[model samples]
Every structure is written in structure tokens, then in C-alpha cells.
Target: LYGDDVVIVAAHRTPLCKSKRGNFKDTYPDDLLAPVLRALIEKTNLNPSEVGDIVVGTVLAPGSQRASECRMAAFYAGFPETVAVRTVNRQCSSGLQAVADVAAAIKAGFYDIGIGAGLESMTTNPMAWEGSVNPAVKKFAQAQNCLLPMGVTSENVAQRFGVSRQEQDQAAVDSHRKAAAATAAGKFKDEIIPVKTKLVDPKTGDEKPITVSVDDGIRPTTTLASLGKLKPVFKKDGTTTAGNSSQVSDGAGAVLLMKRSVAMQKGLPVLGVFRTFAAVGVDPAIMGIGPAVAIPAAVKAAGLELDDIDLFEINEAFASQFVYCRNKLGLDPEKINVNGGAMAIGHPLGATGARCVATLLHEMKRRGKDCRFGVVSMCIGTGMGAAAVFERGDGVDELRNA
Candidate 1:
């Protein structure tokens, strides 16, 4: 082991809920995450007390979730008080960085078992619930363009990169088709934790019936012809549309990373070897080029090149952003989001990162590759992005043998 014996004990996530108006709109962030955490514990057959720590990723922190929501969610989920917890905020990369934090703890030999999780509920708890632009808004806005919403950033990418709405629409269609195919094959059977919600009817004020077992965000029938009919979201000439962008979603993802030595001693099933990762800042005006910077940094860190990577998942906040990054990085579309990305599965903000790592490991296991490297990277708000690399680990002995 690098510094300690750390291993991924398990991985879990809840069925994504379409956080906007419609069915599943009544679900809250905490309600979505609890079952996933429970499933993680149950899947590993581990006691809640055995968990040393819980790290959560969240961007829209408000009211009761103001600070240390990780511990709060854990305790509220009926976890033991003895379990320590904290939170992380790196926007879309929160989930992946949560994993990085656990890896850091394992590397420092500070703990044995830790959990990384992410959640977002744009409907129940939108991004700026508690954050507001006020007195200093003009100054900060002048300096950093704080007034510019993320939608504008996507517009910039489409304009600057010359990506047409048609190209973006085609990409979106492809993502939905791939995701629908994967969902049908049950490729996500192990990871998805079906959730049940109890909510009173908003208008009627009736506490009668409630339940959703699937992600309400997906539209398998979404097509380019249909996408073309939608209006531009940001501006009159903008390319970002509801059909091409990640929907406002609510969902959660989690992973259990522990020391490899401990895993050997305890005989916990192995997942993969944690490898190199990186984060970089870029021009806020052209933020969609994140993978352009991150993918290269991560590849170099892993002592490899562009061709060395076997797959990619460049979080499609919008097809405009994704297409720009793809063109800039010269990425092959077939190898990217082999199942699908946010355009299909939905981007649960903070949850996207951890969900990516979990997806990477699962895909790797399914593909059966050793000594192969893949990346889990995303563009964050405020012009920064994070990329993490992972290899399918054979174990401590294998590392020594290599």
C-alpha cells in the first residue's frame, strides 16, 4: 500500500429523482440519501459503528444543513453517534473529491474506514437558496462575473466553440439511448437503491399516497426533431436548451474506501486501486473547457498519455459544454460515458462526482482490465474542475509484484 492499507469496501447510490415539478418532486435531499447510505452498509454487511467517518458533498446548503450535514444525515439515518462526519463543497466535483478526501485519510494512515457521499435537490433545495448577491454584488460581479449564471457559461462554450444546436441535440439523443439501453440491461442494478418517499399533496394538502422507484428525469423518446422545438434557455441565440442540458435533479451517491491492509485482514472484497488525480482552474467565461485541462493533467499524473485512457465520463452539464470539451480534447465519442452521462442519467450536482467514481469502478470490473486507467472528472462552478484517476487494483501483493 502507498501509505496505508486502504480499499473500497462498497459503493451505493439512490435512484435519481426528477427534482422539478411532476411526480418525485416532493422528495427532499435527506430523504433521497438515507436509503443509499443504508444500502451501502447493508451491502457490505458492516455495522454502522464500524464506519469511521462520513464525508458528504453538497452545494446548496441551507437552514438545517448549514454545516456538517454529513454527520446530520448519518445520525438522522439512524447511524450511531460515535461515527464522525464532515462535508465537502466543490460543486459538480464534490462527490469525486469526497472520495479523494477518504483516500487522503487512508494515505495519511489516519483512519481505517470512511464513506464519501454526494447529493443535490435543485427543486427542493435549489443552488442559491441561502446565497444571494447583494451590496457588493456589483463589485464582485465586475471582477468575477458573479451575476453570470451557469447557463450563460454553457452559452459561451457553444458560441466560442462553434457547436451548433443540432450537434448538441444529437449528443443528447445518443446519451439517452445509451442510458436507456444500459438501464434495460440492468447494468446499474447493483448501484441503484430504489427509494420510497412519504409526502403530503402540496395543493390538496392530503397525506394519502407516495412512492417512486425510478429516476423521473429520463426521457428515452427524446429526439433531435423534438429537441429542435425547445427554446434556448439562456438567451435568444443560445444553444443550451432543456433537451441538451443536465436537468435540475435530486439524487445521491456514496462509496466506502478503506485501507487495503485492513481489507486483506478482514477479507473485504476488493474493488480497484486508487490512482492519481488533479484539479485545475480555467477562464470562467469559457468554463466548459474543463476536461480540456483536467484530462491532460490526470493522464500525465498517471504517467500516461491521451491514448492510455480506456474510457471517459466528462459530466455533460450540457451537450454544448460537452461537445466543446470533446472537440478541444480530441476525445472519441464512443468511449465516453459508455453507458451515458448527466444528459441521460441526470447530474445530481454534488452526487455526480461520487457517482462517476462508482461508475468507473463498476465499468472496469465489468470490462475486466488490470493495469488500466480511467478518469472521473467534472467542471465545477466558479471556473474550476477536478479529475481523478483510478486503476483496477489487483491488491497489495500485485503492486509489489509489479
Candidate 2:
């Protein structure tokens, strides 16, 4: 086992609700984040004031908005002024980056315990919330479509990689089927933090409070035929379609991390540990195949190989890229996203990485034997991929699982 292990004590996430018109459209990012923080404290029995630091990942929101919302969420959960807070963004990998940053800090002896989480309200502050473009980027713009839309990038992958429409549709169907089965079996109950929020009626102008405990985007009824009906949205004859891409979503996720010694001393349950992380750059035009490059690098960094990882949470940003990466790496389909992924649960951008971590750690524990290592990775917008390896630190050491 690696020394200086950073143990995960608690990991939780808000139900991923659809953006703009779904259950959480009225909820502020701060409001979505506060309950997860509060739940982390209560579930792990950790002292809020004792949390040395908290880092949140967010994308799309203005810089001031991101900072203010995160700070207020910390204060809302009774985190004392002594606790420091910071915000980060690396596009889609921002959430995972926050968790890795906290782990790095603890390993470096900067802090003993901390919270790493993410918040995104695509409904309130949609993607491309920033209207201005960098002049440098504009100067390089050409048929390369350096500034092309994300959906267009999916089309680029589809056309270049020869990912057929049928394959894309089949992947979507599989995602929904697996997600539906898992939800029916109550597999997601533990990791999801039920949220209470108010929604306004557009016609009656009446506000009412409701409990949101389940994700709103999963379509258990989605079939290959249903997906085949969706026209390609980016181009006239594109293979990428509305049914195969991740939904815009809003949610938050948080995980508590500390040195293994500190966790043992406190008698806290160990969920898992961060082993290593990697972020690799690629061409922005075809950003979908990022995991093909990143996952191997991360596995190597952990002193392991592709065969050593028992499970993976490769974000389903799009079926073309998802299928392409699996083929590129010769990975086993059954070992990846076993509970479904962004295609069904919705992609809350910044919150997705932490959500994947929560799902991976809990599901690995559930499987018990031989489920020792899990990796969470995602292709970022504008051409990059990030992957992080986590080991089953729950009961490997004598002090763990006590």
C-alpha cells in the first residue's frame, strides 16, 4: 500500500436534476451545495469547525458569483471563519481537480482534514455564461473550428472516428437500462442527499416546496428505436444526437478527506483513498477521446496497469467518445460505469466528477471482493481529459473498518 494515504470519510451528492426547466431550476448553487456540506458533517460526525479547508469547483458562474456562493454555503453549513475556502475551474474536470487538490494538501502536511466538493447551476448560469472570447483564441480561429460549439465537437469525433449512429444509439440504450435497473434497486439511495426546495408555477405564480430525492433525467423507457428517432443536432447528417449526449444539469457533491492516521484516530469510517491523478491536454477539435490518453497515464502513475483497475467511471459526455474510448483502450464494458452515467443521471458539469467519485467508492464497497481499485475520468471541453485513481482503502489497513 502507498504511504501517506489520504482516506475518504464521507462522499455525497445532490440528485442531478435537469437544468432550465427541471426540479432544481429555482435552487441557487449555494442552496444546492449547503445541504451536501451539512450532510457530510452529520453523516461522518465530523466537527464543522475542525475542517481545516474547503475547496469548491464551479464552471460558468462569474468569478465573484462562484466565490460568494461557495463562501455562503460554507457559512450556511456552520463552517467557522477559521476554515479557509477556495474555488477552482478546469472545465469539466474541475470537481475531480478539487478533490485531488485537497488530497495533495493533506499528503503535504498542509492540513489534516478538509472538504473537497463542487457546485454547478446550469439552469441559472448556463454554459458559455461568459460572452466575451479571448482575442488570442479568436486569432487562431479557422475551419479548424477552434471556437466550435461542444455539440459540433461530438460530430467531429463521430465523423472522424467512424462511430456509426447505430452504435451511439445502442450505448444510450444501455446507459438508460443500467441506470433504470440501479435506481429500481435503490443502489443510489445512500450517496444521494435529498434536497428540499421551492418551485414557482409559471402560470399561477404560486410557489411550493417539494422534496427532490431522485434524479429527474433518467428515461428508463429509452430504447434504441427511441434514440434512432432523434435527429443529429449539430449537422445535417451527423451521427451525434440529442439522445446520446449528456443532459445539462444542476447539482452539488462533497467528499471529506484526511490523512489515514487522522481518520483512524477519529474512528471515522474509511470509504476509499486517492491514489493518483492525471490531467492531459489534447486537440480541442476532437476532445471526446481524452480518456483514451489519460486513463493509461493515471494507471501508470499509480504503479498499476489497465488490468489492475476493477472499475471505472468514464463520464459519458457523448456516446461517440464513450464508445471510441472503450475500443481505443480495449476495456471491458462491464467494468465501466456499472450504475450508468451522465447519459442518464445528467451531467452537472462541475459536480459530475465528485458525483462519479461518490458512486464509484460506494459501489466498489458494495461489491466487496476484488473491487480494489476504481478510476474516475472525463473528457473536458476544449480538448483535455482528467483521470484519478482511487484504491479500496476502506478496510485494507488494520485500523480501517473498525
lDDT of each: 0.77, 0.88
Candidate 1 stretches greater than 4 Å from native:
1-5, 63-69, 129-142, 199-211, 393-402
The window of 10 residues in a row where model 2 has the poorest summed lDDT is 393-402
In model 2, the runs with Cα more than 4 Å from the true position are 1-3, 129-146, 202-204, 395-402
lDDT of 2 by residue, 324-375 (tens): 9988899999999999989988898889988888999989989985899999
For model 1, the local distance difference test gives 0.77
List RMSD in Å for every model shown.
3.2, 1.9
Each model's backbone clash number:
9, 0
